[PDB]
């Protein structure tokens, strides 16, 4: 059996529509986003060990709210795709129970082994984070190159995998016009992208950086204005996709 390392899990009402979402926050991430609100999910060797049998015992206690529309399970974190084999086994069990599965991933896929296709086969929705198309900024914002994520995005389109693009709009980092145009061009021909979702930056989770004795880099940075959000949205809409925030 495959052993998963999780930070925590939680049941919570879906953003819209009835029913609940059972989210498992997997432990471990290899990106270093300055704005991470789950800083305590980076350590790959931390968290708690669980099995798929352990996880399904919590899932089934919410079964009557997960057949409801928008309900199901979501693998988040942290980066769930670092533990693709476990998430594949977990989703495989949810498909046996008629459960909708969602993968909340940064797309930092470094190796294309068969476990990736196997995971995607039992994944209904992929929420992919494109943090910055400008790789010069991306390195300063995330600590790594966006090449792996951009290649993974193209892989999802080739496989016609349902994808929601998530763009965290941070003032001074990803609120400029050029970066928005680059995002619109890159995702224009991806028919599998149902919509692009602009997430405004928030300072939630700053205490997690302080608990680990590390300075929060984005001190003083405020959430984007409603005008900036509308401006980026209007730019992205010029490339055909449904854009909402
Ligand atoms: C913490 S992540 C886990 C999924 C995966 N690690 C990722 O980042 O794509 C869940 C979502 O919260 C977003 N997020 C993280 N920090 C944020 C912040 N300070 N403000 C707004 N959104 C944030 C992430 O970009 C991602 O869309
Ligand atoms: S990818 Fe997600 S979990 Fe990893 S550092 Fe960035 S915001 Fe945090
Ligand atoms: Cl959390
Ligand atoms: Cl390796
Ligand atoms: Cl590839
Ligand atoms: K995501």
């Amino acid at each position: 059996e495959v052993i998963g390392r999780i930070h925590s899990f939680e049941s919570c009402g879906t953003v819209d529509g009835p029913g609940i979402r059972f989210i498992t926050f997997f432990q471990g991430c290899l990106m270093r986003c300055l704005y991470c609100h789950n800083r305590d999910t980076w350590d790959t060797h931390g968290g708690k060990e669980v099995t798929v049998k352990d996880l399904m015992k919590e899932v089934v206690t919410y079964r009557h709210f997960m057949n409801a529309s928008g309900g199901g399970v979501t693998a988040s974190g942290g980066e769930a795709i670092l533990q693709a084999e476990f998430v594949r086994d977990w989703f495989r069990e949810c498909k046996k129970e008629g459960i909708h599965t969602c993968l909340d991933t940064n797309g930092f896929v470094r190796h294309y082994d068969p476990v990736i296709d196997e995971l995607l086969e039992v994944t209904d929705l992929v929420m992919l984070d494109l943090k910055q198309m400008n790789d010069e900024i991306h390195k300063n914002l995330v600590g790594v190159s966006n090449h792996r994520t951009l290649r993974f995005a193209q892989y999802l389109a080739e496989k016609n995998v349902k994808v929601w693009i998530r763009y965290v709009v941070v003032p001074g980092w990803s609120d400029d016009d050029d970066s928005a145009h680059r995002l619109g061009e890159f995702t224009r021909d991806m028919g599998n992208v149902e919509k692009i979702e602009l997430l405004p930056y928030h300072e939630l989770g700053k205490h997690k950086w302080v608990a680990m004795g590390e300075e929060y880099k984005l001190d003083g940075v405020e959430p984007p204005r409603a005008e900036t959000m509308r401006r980026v949205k209007g730019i992205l809409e010029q490339y055909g996709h449904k854009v909402m925030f």
Side-chain angles (χ1 to χ4, degrees), residues 109 111-112 148 151-152 155 158:
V109 174
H111 306 293
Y112 279 89
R148 297 291 200 177
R151 180 56 191 101
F152 188 65
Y155 191 76
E158 180 181 4

Side-chain angles (χ1 to χ4, degrees), residues 36-48:
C36 185
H37 62 202
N38 294 333
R39 169 59 183 84
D40 60 342
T41 67
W42 290 6
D43 191 310
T44 61
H45 285 111
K48 300 179 174 180

Side-chain angles (χ1 to χ4, degrees), residues 71-101:
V73 301
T74 296
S76 185
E79 185 41 53
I81 214 159
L82 293 170
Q83 307 186 51
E85 184 180 17
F86 182 91
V87 181
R88 173 207 64 187
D89 294 337
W90 182 32
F91 283 8
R92 275 176 174 175
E93 286 309 294
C94 298
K95 303 315 286 179
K96 296 178 183 176
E97 307 285 0
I99 294 176
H100 182 276
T101 60

Side-chain angles (χ1 to χ4, degrees), residues 35 37-38 76-79 104-106 129 131 168 199-200 202:
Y35 55 71
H37 62 202
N38 294 333
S76 185
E79 185 41 53
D104 195 46
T105 177
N106 60 20
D129 255 57
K131 295 169 188 291
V168 171
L199 296 177
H202 56 241

Side-chain angles (χ1 to χ4, degrees), residues 133-184:
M133 296 301 307
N134 193 308
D135 199 18
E136 298 179 345
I137 300 175
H138 195 273
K139 293 179 184 176
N140 290 310
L141 181 62
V142 191
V144 306
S145 170
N146 63 8
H147 181 63
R148 297 291 200 177
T149 300
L150 298 183
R151 180 56 191 101
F152 188 65
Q154 299 174 326
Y155 191 76
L156 297 175
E158 180 181 4
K159 301 291 191 170
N160 197 28
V161 176
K162 190 176 293 186
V163 162
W164 294 359
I165 298 293
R166 289 277 182 86
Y167 191 48
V168 171
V169 182
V170 181
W173 289 90
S174 51
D175 67 334
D176 57 291
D177 285 43
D178 181 64
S179 290
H181 286 287
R182 295 206 198 183
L183 178 61

